[PDB]
Structure 1
Amino acid sequence: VHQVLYRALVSTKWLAESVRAGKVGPGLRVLDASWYSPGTREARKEYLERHVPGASFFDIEECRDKASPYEVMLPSEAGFADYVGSLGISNDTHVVVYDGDDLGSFYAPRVWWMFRVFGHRTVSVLNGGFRNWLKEGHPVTSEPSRPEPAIFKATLNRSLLKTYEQVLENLESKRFQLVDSRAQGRYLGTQPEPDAVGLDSGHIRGSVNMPFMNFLTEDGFEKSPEELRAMFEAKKVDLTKPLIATCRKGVTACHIALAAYLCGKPDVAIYDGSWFEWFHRAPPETWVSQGKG
């Protein structure tokens, strides 16, 4: 359920002109969705110091199922709806998401997919991220944003989500191509999985690896659609066939979904449980690692 695709990328120039124009409001809401591993950057404090004028902080640590044993799992429809409503977002709002990643994108695609998986098509990511917004000198502020509340209705679009059981069945059916966006070393099992206890690295049998950072240019901009298409083809990923994206915790997998969407394939589903869930639930026979093990 959607044939003509709504823009998934907006430029810094466009967003800056919109903010100059007074467009932030019910029709346009801007989110910093940054999140960092423990012991590194301070997402909320960075947002407090420097944000696009009128933007809000989208707290992924809150906007998830807290009761799950697994990482960064979708909240319920109500939890999402209540949270986004509280940021002034309704079903008529154009949501623009950025993050402060050093290359140019990490969490923002996750948030773009969250809106889509909850039925909202009017969502985009800021091409080049906050990194480029800053480099180009666009306005930043520490003034508080206080959007008026709105009502949002969320409706899960199951086709854009996969469960553990569906990935396990797929091991057998081979119906979907399973593409993992984690860095190469962790995908192969030669580098450990971080921020976890006794979680081995490796990958689900039958997977293909497409490290997420390959999607962006060295400046942090999305690669062109011709470039993206060439990447999938060189990976033996056929865009005319079904595709499930997976990673550590369902976050960077959303960069595969974004890349495929800009190549005209909106149908990629995210395995939200991802490797973290897989390792904990699946028989070890279903995964491989170079060490090995």
Structure 2
Amino acid sequence: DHTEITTDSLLALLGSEKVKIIDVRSADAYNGWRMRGEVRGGHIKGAKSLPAKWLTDPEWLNIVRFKQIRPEDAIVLYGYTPEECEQTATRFKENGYNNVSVFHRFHPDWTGNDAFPMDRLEQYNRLVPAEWVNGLISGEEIPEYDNDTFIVCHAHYRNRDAYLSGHIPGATDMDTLALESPETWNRRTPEELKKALEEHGITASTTVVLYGKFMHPDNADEFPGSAAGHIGAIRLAFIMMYAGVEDVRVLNGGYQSWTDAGFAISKDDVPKTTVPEFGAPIPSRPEFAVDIDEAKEMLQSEDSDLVCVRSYPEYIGEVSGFNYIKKKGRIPGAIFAECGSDAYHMENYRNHDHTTREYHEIEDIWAKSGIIPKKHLAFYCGTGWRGSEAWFNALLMGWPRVSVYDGGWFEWSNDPENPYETGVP
């Protein structure tokens, strides 16, 4: 039936390839959130992330095999309690994984003893869990927060129904058109950004928690981006951090994470409180956004490289990805980092619950193509949405020189004098 591994045995196996240490806690605890008040947040060094809440996913066995977890591997599960990994161990044993052990002493033994190595997402407090947002709006004391004023922002693209059909209590909505211009789909000018943030009640010293709602985008609609709300949320996070909002948060997973926790929702139309001054020059961090001239300079630079976060059909020129762009092709010289199925999904950068994919798997995929934190990188896609999320992931890992090429394929292909390749490489 069972098998236990002690702290002594597990420590002498952290480098072994045939053992797979599996963290069954939440992805937010995996990244470094001290969800139980532990003195050290994060995961055991070398652990893979497989939250036990995914056991209800009928694709659980495919998620396991997409993580290269093979039946001949020595499975080592752990969590906050050994009872957390019991239903996952049985789930493995019935599917042919006969070598399955459970590590009992991750908390407080492994966490409360510095001799045991742990790892965490370097900027994890920017990727907040649902419990953190609940305590924030409830006035309760929470870690990783020490501010007076905050604003929860529900993001969407010309679809206020996404906000009115159910949102977080006290939350105000923000159309993506408040921060990006429809003529270029780039960030707005500083004066427009200053005026837009003030009429939403955002100052430079205001903590902004951003999130969106996944509403199953279909490529047959007029505005599929009106259903990819959480992508626009991270897209708005990049713009605010570019503008100068010093403390910007993102609810990991979006509206799905709020309802999964079981918290109350509101359907009210909360009015916007206005603030008279933003209080900081815009943009305060202009290095986060590059334009077309510097993007062309980064292609020929040995120190730089562009990252194409688009789908494979767009990359080979089969489709343009959008119903308002007609030219198909790819920018020559960029490194391909596939986002997923189409222009409104991020399968390769997300779990099924829309939380950010295990960042180690993101680093390993990026590393195989030469995408490393030593370079100055500018992520881009069609118009900057999918590139903003890829940039946010690299920002969360503490990469020192990452940016977004706002123009993307939209601005690039609009100039006939700009080159582009097509077809399979």
Pair 1:126-2:260 in alignment: no
Contact 1:102 1:131 in 2 (8 A): no
Match of 1:209 among 320, 323, 336: 336
After superposition, the C-alpha distances for 1:178-206 in whole angstroms (9 at most, x for unaligned) are 11111121122123332215x22221111
- Identity, % of aligned positions: 23
Match of 1:192 among 320, 324, 344: 320
After superposition, the C-alpha distances for 1:213-248 in whole angstroms (9 at most, x for unaligned) are 211112211123323222221332112111011100
Q: 1:65-84 residue pairs with structure 2 within 5 A?
A: 65-66=181-182, 69-70=183-184, 72-84=185-197
Contact 2:299 2:334 in 1 (8 A): no
One-letter amino acid matched to 1:171:
L
Greater CA drift, 121-130 or 262-271: 262-271
Pair 1:63-2:159 in alignment: no
After superposition, the C-alpha distances for 1:11-59 in whole angstroms (9 at most, x for unaligned) are 0111112222279x96110111122xxxxxx720120221111111111
Partner of 2:128: 10
After superposition, the C-alpha distances for 1:96-149 in whole angstroms (9 at most, x for unaligned) are 110112588311111111011112230011101112212332221122322431
Contact 1:177 1:242 in 2 (8 A): yes
One-letter amino acid matched to 1:9:
L
Q: 1:1-293 residue pairs with structure 2 within 5 A?
A: 7-21=125-139, 27-35=149-157, 43-66=159-182, 69-70=183-184, 72-102=185-215, 105-150=230-275, 151-152=277-278, 153-156=280-283, 157-197=285-325, 199-212=326-339, 213=346, 214-281=348-415, 283-284=417-418, 286-290=419-423
How far apart, in 2, do the equivalents of 1:99 and 1:136 lie? 16
After superposition, the C-alpha distances for 1:70-119 in whole angstroms (9 at most, x for unaligned) are 2x211111211211111111111110110112588311111111011112
RMSD: 2.4
Distance 1:129 1:231, change over 3 A: same
Distance 1:137 1:233, change over 3 A: same
TM-score of the superposed pair, with normalisation by structure 2: 0.60
What are the ranges of 5 or more consecutive residues in structure 1 without an aligned counterpart?
Answer: 36-41
Contact 1:182 1:210 in 2 (8 A): yes
TM-score of the superposed pair, with normalisation by structure 1: 0.86
Name the SS of the counterpart of 1:43 in structure 2: coil
How far apart, in 2, do the equivalents of 1:190 and 1:54 lie? 44
Partner of 1:38: none
How far apart, in 1, do the equivalents of 2:328 and 2:272 lie? 42
Contact 2:235 2:388 in 1 (8 A): yes
Name the SS of the counterpart of 2:156 in structure 1: coil
How far apart, in 2, do the equivalents of 1:180 and 1:32 lie? 27
Displacement of 1:272 = 0.9
Contact 1:26 1:90 in 2 (8 A): no
Partner of 2:41: none
Contact 2:292 2:407 in 1 (8 A): yes
Aligned length: 277
How far apart, in 2, do the equivalents of 1:144 and 1:291 lie? 48
Displacement of 1:282 = 5.2
How far apart, in 2, do the equivalents of 1:235 and 1:8 lie? 27
Displacement of 1:291 = 7.6
Distance 1:230 1:168, change over 3 A: same
Contact 2:375 2:401 in 1 (8 A): no
One-letter amino acid matched to 1:18:
L
Greater CA drift, 89-98 or 42-51: 42-51
Distance 1:235 1:101, change over 3 A: farther
Distance 1:164 1:282, change over 3 A: farther
What are the ranges of 5 or more consecutive residues in structure 2 without an aligned counterpart?
Answer: 1-121, 142-146, 217-227, 340-345
Contact 1:7 1:123 in 2 (8 A): no
Greater CA drift, 84-93 or 169-178: 169-178
Distance 1:282 1:176, change over 3 A: farther
Displacement of 1:7 = 2.9
Distance 1:28 1:6, change over 3 A: farther
How far apart, in 2, do the equivalents of 1:154 and 1:233 lie? 36
After superposition, the C-alpha distances for 1:242-286 in whole angstroms (9 at most, x for unaligned) are 1011100011101111111122114311111110110012525x2
